[PDB]
Amino acid sequence: QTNWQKLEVFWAKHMWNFISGIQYLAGLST
Secondary structure (H helix, E strand, O other), X not given: OOHHHHHHHHHHHHXXXXXXXXXXXXXXXX
């Protein structure tokens, strides 16, 4: 294994950023 293991770590980091933006906008929406 090499960058593949990092791709899954990368995947959750990006996926959580998608969820943090929605959580942030949910409380700060218009």
